[PDB]
């Protein structure tokens, strides 16, 4: 049983991950400058 | 041997590598307000 498609699924959840820590450092500095 | 894998995954890897240069933005805009 073979497929490519988990791979790069874990790759998008991955990155979404990273998408949404930078989500958390902009409302991070949208608190901090208001 | 021919696929079409390795050329989407290397797109992902160079906006990875993009991502990352975002995030160190980030953190340094996060360094310098702070």
Tied chains: 1, 2.
Excluded: P, T, V, Y
């Amino acid at each position: 049983a073979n497929d490519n498609s988990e791979e790069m699924r874990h790759r998008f959840r991955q990155l979404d991950s990273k998408l949404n820590d930078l989500k958390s450092l902009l409302k991070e500095i949208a608190n901090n400058i208001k």
